[model samples]
Target: SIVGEALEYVNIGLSHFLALPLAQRISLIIIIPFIYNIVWQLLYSLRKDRPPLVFYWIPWVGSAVVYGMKPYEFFEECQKKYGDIFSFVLLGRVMTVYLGPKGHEFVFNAKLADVSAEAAYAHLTTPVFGKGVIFDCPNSRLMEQKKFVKGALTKEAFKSYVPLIAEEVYKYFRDSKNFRLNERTTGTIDVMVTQPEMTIFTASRSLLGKEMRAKLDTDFAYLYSDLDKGFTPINFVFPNLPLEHYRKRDHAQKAISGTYMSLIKERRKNNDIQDRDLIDSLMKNSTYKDGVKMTDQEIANLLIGVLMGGQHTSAATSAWILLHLAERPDVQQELYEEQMRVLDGGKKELTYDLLQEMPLLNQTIKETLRMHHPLHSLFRKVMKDMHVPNTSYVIPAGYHVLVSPGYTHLRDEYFPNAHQFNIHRWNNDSASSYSVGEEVDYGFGAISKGVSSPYLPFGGGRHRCIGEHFAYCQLGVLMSIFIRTLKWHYPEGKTVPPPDFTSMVTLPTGPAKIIWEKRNPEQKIGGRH
Candidate 1:
């Protein structure tokens, strides 16, 4: 929202543009040729050793507008020009974009010695995640940190979490809009509001403790909304700007960290050694193989950092799924029948095992992810001179490289008849949710070393998401509850809105609204009953 606002402010400045129309004309007259000459020279600035450069006119703001606003357009536009590897200057650095599945393999599986995700991501993350965690820490320590949280998100732990997450979501339905679920036979909700609220409630109660979910008061959600603005395009370019959003971001980080610190201390003093959530796991066992300990503040930082990743992806995915399902009631009906058939007419309590049993429900999520994968771009700073495989292009040590698995998921080449929303497209390949590959551990655990897939919703290599099962589990349960309890459709004569790329992840251009009716109005709920 803040980035979109910044873009608006620039336009407002330009809106007064015609006031000095003649001066603008005069300035334009001089600058146009000056800009033209630079583009002309750079196009002819031949180098067989380096990748073909994308044609750019401006000096430091090179390609920033088109690339930031419409990334796949930029990626596709450049792909046709340079055929997979090309360089463009963006906000003062020359960035090399590598496209297609092979390019995906090259960068993600590139040597840790030769590339760094931490360098590209740290500035935007450190302020919100605080110090000593995530991108702020060294690679070794950070991987170890992922393992600590990964251990807690195990199959056994996930089974334990289903009931907890269900309870949280049901509580949200009851108290949050303060319920239109039972208040009336019908309702409508802004998906942006409800989906994000649903995710944080489930995530908090399951990942933190029951106590953690309660403290998510009125201001708590807004504080998170405030911090999400920290991932704006402006922050990536100028992380410490003398700006209001930056101030709010700092405030959000400290406040959340302080909240976690207090809870950790309480758990320490009142040790029952009870089974709870990731918080307890980190507190007790977040030590390295070398015996270095995780301090209270660091554990606090880890919780913020890990939850932030899933929050952005899962929330958007949920919102997108709801709108698509609303548009396709036939698909929704299919899911609802699958639910009834699997749950034996809703007599059985939903468990992780039960959630896993519904293939149509799983395919519904896979289809939505294909349409709206969370991140548009993944970037790495080139740490040493690297050459394009089989192509005569060399990227220098200080240059930047970017890969877009999201773009690949969109391309017509990979999935035929790609734009249509059909869960049945995946019916042939149950491995549609498959991140399957040769497995290898990189300090965290054994992960699919498969970066070659054109359709990657969860990224690959060492950085493949550890939270995959957890996000899937929550998504299945959340969608199951909706499928069983409600029937919804568009609240208006409109299709799903286009994506809003104003923040870290994709959001629908505005809050999406759906008209709804309770399938069982008198039914009280469990996590799922």
Candidate 2:
């Protein structure tokens, strides 16, 4: 009876097996071997080469705390442990850390073949730039935009804007009549409170040209200030949050975009605007993919790109130079003397050629840039697997790359006794020894050429700042005019404050209070000196 029951059970099992299809059987056979082969290859690959794990890991937030607290320290610690080149996974992606002068040279120079700048800034600038000009375009398109903007920075354009800038500065000084005043002998006046708006007006005039520059003063500047100060990861992460800062940024973006859009539309309608203003140049020239011209939206995006670029950076730079000069009265006196010589030449407005003659003013701007580069780091997203030369490593594709000019500028090898802020280093007898690429001449050419390895204040290579020359002109004008017209010094005992940079762009955060007294033109200096 037991044998009969076993035979019947075997027959039932055989019937169930016969119901399965030949395709299903083959699929199982193929899938099992394929998965096994993949696993084997993965293990073999891991054994051959493994990534050097360098940074501390967090569950969801990767390296956020360390980087947020102090990016300079974070990079230094990583470099100390992992050599000049190392890769770490952070924020759901991998990035290479580049250190030392040679490595920075390679990263900044490699843009010829690999388009890294666009990739590095794409995500961060998405909301600001939308899909146009600097953000959306590839390196070549970005280059075209640069060419257009560069044309706008010609001698003619600068000459047109000088009177505008001078006018704005005068207006700002006049507006300061109601500012809190103490005794003419001694007391504190808030340098920032008196000067921030002046800087904004200067930046707007230089960037947007005359009429629109005035609009920026009346309509856009305050909104921009709120938005600019609110730039942080929280805003970047959640753009439409129900926060005042976010709302401010949103409103500013909309207002600025609308302003640009309206202005560009009117320019397009009128066809008579021939001058190489930024908007006219961008519209008349510059093309994108397939020989296509940029649309209105694209033009608007480009305006936003340069607006944000020009506003904060130039303002902060203007502030830093004044703050430093205020503390050092001797330096201020030298600057005053230099200005007298320039004004004696019967030139009422600062120009490109005139800017070439002022040595002290030139040195002051370069020193400020060397010490406080507007941005702390240049970010790039690696587009392909690349090698950082002079090293024996291959950086994998899809990694973030960061270059810091702040640390490089301070290196003792390039600048001996780097801690000291001496403008003489730029104007000494042996200044040519510091020169690299171009021949070192005097004044503007000397300072411009002297910016080589250790001086990447405007960055290097193809993507170098288009506004470099214009920026120098702007700062030179401001410094020359202010130093001649005003007497400034710090409040009694407080030292000149270092950059109060808890954020990306460096600012003079503090009791950087100073006293400003209008100078009598007849006394030590005059209309024609």
Candidate 3:
């Protein structure tokens, strides 16, 4: 009887609400999401096993503006307020952040059955990268895929790459629109423009071979630009949005993939399989242990993935290194000196062996990666109920998890003088790359699975970036070339800018400019002595 009265009151009042004056109905209708916020609050209030939720005034958009704007600052703010583990709402997903090195282990080293990188990344990567490769495939296959690619990224490949990387950088310096330093004594280069182009050009000429690099000038290399535009956060969240760039990316994927397919078929017909480049390497060696082979189409798609992934990473990392060196040109002088010492006082051509001989040069790369990691956050979707270790909290399936190793790399407790960009700090081997643990092979040969290190620039665990060696090699060559060829500095009053987190990767906020001049304007190597 009492329940009937409750139902009757709402039923009658709802009808009464429908009969209300226009002004009255309109006024009461304005506060719906606030009520929604309260409902979610009440629901969370009922749960004891959840990590503490960051309070917010809005429903689905909770804490997003702050979290989106500066994630590290937001992470710092929330960590102190709600302990190391906390949940914040991000565009309708409940994102749980694990705040330190232990958190790094928890997220990166989580059971594969308990988390899914594919779930978080597939929709973001598949359409742009094409099907039959990468996130579109099963995790087991991706594990194998890394092994196939690793066959080409060996020390021998780095040996092959050094001269080619230097050749391209030298060519680009003379030809690049932003750096026509051939005639100008000094000019301002927006490194934001220069580095990405340099990264793509050098990666293509060296990794893909000259023929593929030639196609970039006349063919759908515009497709490279078109495809990469799809990597924005908007595209990640709403991939099928009927937008112009969406259509553009789909077309670029088709064209680039088609072009790679044509070239691959030509290689097969000519019996041109050799280890000369990654494309040929893939053609010869892409069979899984089970003997399941990738189709020609998939091989081409994988190349796009490889080159594009390198584009953003090496591009941003290189740009950041230049910008920081600009602000500290004294270090620029030191790097030049280091290069001279390593190359036998400028009498030796740069070689893969010589990069090891240049500790300061390698440390410059290390310090930049620390001060500005290529990626600010690593995300994996929770696939099942996951526990926050040593706590009553469990992040239920359907939520997402984030770990910021970038933040861990910045903490003073680990680095002592964390954010100051002091390259000397790494010379002591105190906060080394990773503590050696038992090796684990996820089909890519045995790699260290340690997530204990706070200095994971290329990441760790089974999902670790296989390009770590390639990146070090690529960056090493580029730095060696640039430091020896040019002298540069930031405009007098400027400092390295804060990172722009709006893109999928971290980049310095734009107009990332530096003024550079040739070390020897009269030096000749391409055609003359």
On TM-score, the candidate that comes out on top is 3
> What is the per-residue lDDT of model 2 for residues 230-282, given as tens digits with 9 covering 90 to 100?
55555434556676766676677677777777878787787756674677777
TM-score ranking from best to worst? 3, 1, 2
Clashing pairs in 1: 166-527
**lDDT of every model, 2 decimals:** 0.84, 0.65, 0.85
Work out candidate 3's RMSD over C-alphas: 2.1
The runs of at least 3 residues in candidate 2 whose Cα sits more than 4 Å from the true structure, single-residue gaps closed, are: 1-53, 57-63, 76-83, 87-93, 111-115, 177-196, 217-220, 226-230, 233-244, 270-272, 288-290, 345-349, 428-452, 521-529
Which candidate gets the maximum lDDT versus the true structure? 3
Model 2: which residue pairs collide?
none
- Model 3, runs deviating above 4 Å: 1-7, 20-30, 42-46, 428-435
Worst 10 residues of 1 by lDDT: 428-437
Q: Over the stretch 1-529, how does candidate 1's per-residue lDDT look in tens digits?
A: 3699989889997887657679777998778777885966565457787888877767677888888778888888888877888888888888888888987898889999889999999998888888898899888988899899997889899999999888777777765663546466677788888888899889998999877787886567677778777866678878998889888888988888888999899988988446679988888789888888988888998999888889889999999999999899999899999999999998999998988889899988888989898888888999999988797788889999988888888888998877889899878564334646578889988777778888888887777778888998899899998888889899668789888765689778776788888888787544432
Ranking of models by lDDT: 3, 1, 2
Question: Which 10 consecutive positions of candidate 2 have the poorest summed lDDT?
Answer: 440-449
Candidate 3 lDDT, 428-518, residue by residue in tens: 5522255477778777888677787778887777788888778888888998888998888878788889899888889999997888988
